Amino acid sequence: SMKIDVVTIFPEYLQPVRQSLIDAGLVDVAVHDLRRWTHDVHKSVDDSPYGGGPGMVMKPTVWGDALDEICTSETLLVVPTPAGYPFTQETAWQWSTEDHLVIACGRYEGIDQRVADDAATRMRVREVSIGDYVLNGGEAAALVIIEAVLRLVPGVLSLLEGPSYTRPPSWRGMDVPPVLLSGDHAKIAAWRAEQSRQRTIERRPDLLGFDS
Amino acid sequence: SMKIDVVTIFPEYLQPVRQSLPGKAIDAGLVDVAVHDLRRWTHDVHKSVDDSPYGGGPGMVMKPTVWGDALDEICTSETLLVVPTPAGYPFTQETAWQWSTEDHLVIACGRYEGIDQRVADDAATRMRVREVSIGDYVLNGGEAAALVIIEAVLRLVPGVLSLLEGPSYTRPPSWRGMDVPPVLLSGDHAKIAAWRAEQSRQRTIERRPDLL
Ligand SMILES: COc1ccc(-c2cc(N)[nH]n2)cc1
Numbered sequence: 494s495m496k497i498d499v500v501t502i503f504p505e506y507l508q509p510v511r512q513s514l515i516d517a518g519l520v521d522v523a524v525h526d527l528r529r530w531t532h533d534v535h536k537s538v539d540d541s542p543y544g545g546g547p548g549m550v551m552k553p554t555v556w557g558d559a560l561d562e563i564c565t566s567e568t569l570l571v572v573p574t575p576a577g578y579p580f581t582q583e584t585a586w587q588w589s590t591e592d593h594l595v596i597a598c599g600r601y602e603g604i605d606q607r608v609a610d611d612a613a614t615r616m617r618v619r620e621v622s623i624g625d626y627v628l629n630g631g632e633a634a635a636l637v638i639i640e641a642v643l644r645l646v647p648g649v650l651s652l653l654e655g656p657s658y659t660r661p662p663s664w665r666g667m668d669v670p671p672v673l674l675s676g677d678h679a680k681i682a683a684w685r686a687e688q689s690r691q692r693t694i695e696r697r698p699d700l701l702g703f704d705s
Numbered sequence: 706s707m708k709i710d711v712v713t714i715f716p717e718y719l720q721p722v723r724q725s726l727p728g729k730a731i732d733a734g735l736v737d738v739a740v741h742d743l744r745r746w747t748h749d750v751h752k753s754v755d756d757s758p759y760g761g762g763p764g765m766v767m768k769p770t771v772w773g774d775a776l777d778e779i780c781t782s783e784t785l786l787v788v789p790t791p792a793g794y795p796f797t798q799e800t801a802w803q804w805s806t807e808d809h810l811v812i813a814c815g816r817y818e819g820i821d822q823r824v825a826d827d828a829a830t831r832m833r834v835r836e837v838s839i840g841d842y843v844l845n846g847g848e849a850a851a852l853v854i855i856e857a858v859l860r861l862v863p864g865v866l867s868l869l870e871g872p873s874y875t876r877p878p879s880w881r882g883m884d885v886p887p888v889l890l891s892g893d894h895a896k897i898a899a900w901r902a903e904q905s906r907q908r909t910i911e912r913r914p915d916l917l
């Protein structure tokens with residue numbers, strides 16, 4: 494059993510998770526509007542940065558009140574950010590056995606650093622990046638993290654994968670590799686091992702300890 | 706002026722994209738995103754999109770005949786065909802900048818174990834094809850990756866909407882016992898810039914030593 498809470502100023506962006514990645518009852522996912530923890534009539538969640546810079550920063554006060562209500566000492570607080578530790582398959586396996594994830598989604602130029610720092614005095618906190626590109630906010634990263642983690646949960650139970658094929662054996666004058674039709678398990682395993690190592694050196698040489 | 710077509714068996718998953726697009730950019734004709742149900746191009750009464758893998762293995766493979774008809778209708782010679790896959794070349798910020806000046810992106814979203822390799826190989830004989838990964842984790846299908854790519858590319862198109870960045874702060878100057886670093890309130894802007902550079906250097910050493 495896992496519970497996931499997502500906090501955001503754009504709750505509508507999280508609807509793609511509504512169609513189960515939940516239907517079984519293994520996991521429960523809930524989405525919260527950050528603005529519900531404001532108190533002024535304009536529901537202001539942002540202010541200009543100290544020390545200069547472009548754009549706006551999310552205020553710590555509103556975030557602190559939201560996390561106070563949602564989190565406990567058992568919670569793993571997840572904060573997507575381009576400046577984070579890398580989120581990898583290893584991370585996904587680690588988080589797949591957690592009881593409670595809370596994902597805090599930033600907008601504007603980001604969240605006041607004291608939010609994560611205050612939270613770390615009460616619970617475990619992980620600032621993470623899902624890849625070396627920049628988004629407008631954390632919501633799409635939240636969807637990626639939820640999908641990668643939930644598929645590993647017990648109950649929903651290196652090198653690059655090579656190419657796959659299915660019927661018909663000839664299509665537009667292009668043939669499925671004959672070894673794959675041969676029924677020879679040893680030869681098929683060897684061919685697939687070689688396609689994978691060939692794809693890896695071409696596309697991801699870093700995975701085998703080479704440059705670029 | 707960019708057109709994006711997305712092809713998927715789960716069209717509702719791409720809901721956040723159309724919802725995040727400002728009317729002004731659509732009205733100005735800067736961007737158009739369209740989502741297509743792959744089952745529109747199936748041949749049989751059961752609307753089949755998958756079949757068993759040649760050479761054996763777990764799961765299923767998406768049929769080349771269905772995908773071939775879909776891409777024949779949607780793509781032209783000027784199309785950049787994007788195929789998300791864990792076995793792809795890395796999608797990075799430089800990729801996003803490159804794709805931001807394209808006239809037509811088509812994103813082919815896989816499910817099951819992937820798409821028969823002859824689909825991409827045939828398409829590459831008449832248009833540019835890019836198989837790409839958005840990070841070193843595995844998803845159930847390409848839809849969440851399509852959301853990430855669309856957001857990272859379109860935020861670089863005007864008006865559509867090295868080292869790691871250090872921490873950001875805003876009001877109040879003191880919160881839950883934590884003060885904003887006094888240098889940021891000093892009015893010494895050369896010193897502030899040097900402080901930010903050192904914060905960035907330390908964060909990069911701790912979280913991303915690969916960047917150094
Ligand atoms: C403003 O709030 C955010 C939160 C997260 C991101 C992000 C994370 C990654 N790997 N790319 N972009 C950007 C902005």
Ligand SMILES: COc1ccc(-c2cc(N)[nH]n2)cc1
Pocket residue numbers: 789790791792814815816817818819820837838839840841842843844845846847850
């Ligand atoms: C079966 O269709 C897909 C398509 C893409 C993926 C993917 C891409 C990345 N970076 N992780 N997972 C998985 C399955």
